[PDB]
Design a binder for this molecule. Sequence first.
Ligand SMILES: *[C@@H]1O[C@H](CO)[C@@H](O[C@@H]2O[C@H](CO)[C@@H](O)[C@H](O)[C@H]2NC(C)=O)[C@H](O)[C@H]1NC(C)=O
Ligand SMILES: *[C@@H]1O[C@H](CO)[C@@H](O)[C@H](O)[C@H]1NC(C)=O
Lengths: 48, 27
Amino acid sequence: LAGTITSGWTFGAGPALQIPFPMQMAYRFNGIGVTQNVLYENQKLIAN
Amino acid sequence: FVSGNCDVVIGIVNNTVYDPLQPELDS
Ligand SMILES: *[C@@H]1O[C@H](CO)[C@@H](O[C@@H]2O[C@H](CO)[C@@H](O)[C@H](O)[C@H]2NC(C)=O)[C@H](O)[C@H]1NC(C)=O
Ligand SMILES: *[C@@H]1O[C@H](CO)[C@@H](O)[C@H](O)[C@H]1NC(C)=O
């Protein structure tokens, strides 16, 4: 849990590199075909 | 790429975005 929260998927393929959690969520949103601005503009709703 | 304005995002930062076209136009 700590690894997947503080470093995303990097810790599973080498050294663990830190990254802020909203930026990781933006990365994962890009993973499924949605742009970052959607998450950055609906962060509060998504967290709720 | 541009989207929206500078109040919705949390953690936005002042900086400058260079435009390649302007110096060519002025030259
Ligand atoms: C980042 O965004 C802009 C960049 O100029 C700033 O917005 C104005 O900045 C001036 C000078 O700093 C202030 O007097 C104004 O009150 C700001 N707001 C508006 C609506 O004009 C902003 O202050 C910059 N810095 C941040 C957001 O920390
Ligand atoms: C990041 O953390 C510092 C101190 O922990 C805090 O002052 C700052 O507001 C945080 N960043 C944002 C975007 O809130």
